[PDB]
Amino acid sequence: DLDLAKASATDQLKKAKAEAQVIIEQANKRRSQILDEAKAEAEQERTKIVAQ
């Protein structure tokens, strides 16, 4: 157990670390989607408003 307390503790920590950051990797991908779309639709609405 005094070996476990490192061998498995560090792995729990590492796995939690990697997942804690790749959650945010996916979330960054999502905000890329959102701030693409924010312009993509706004320009179409511009081209409607000034055709009106």
Add this chain to the structure above:
Amino acid sequence: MNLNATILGQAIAFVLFVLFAMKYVWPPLMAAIEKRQKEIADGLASAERAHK
């Protein structure tokens, strides 16, 4: 029975036997014990700190 100089002859062998056991048997056979108790403690401190 009759008291005899044996009372004094034996006081020698007694008091000296005590020293030739004390100086060379007792601390040794307590060392063999304490040196194992010091080890018995470590496994338990391990297990507990490892749980923690």
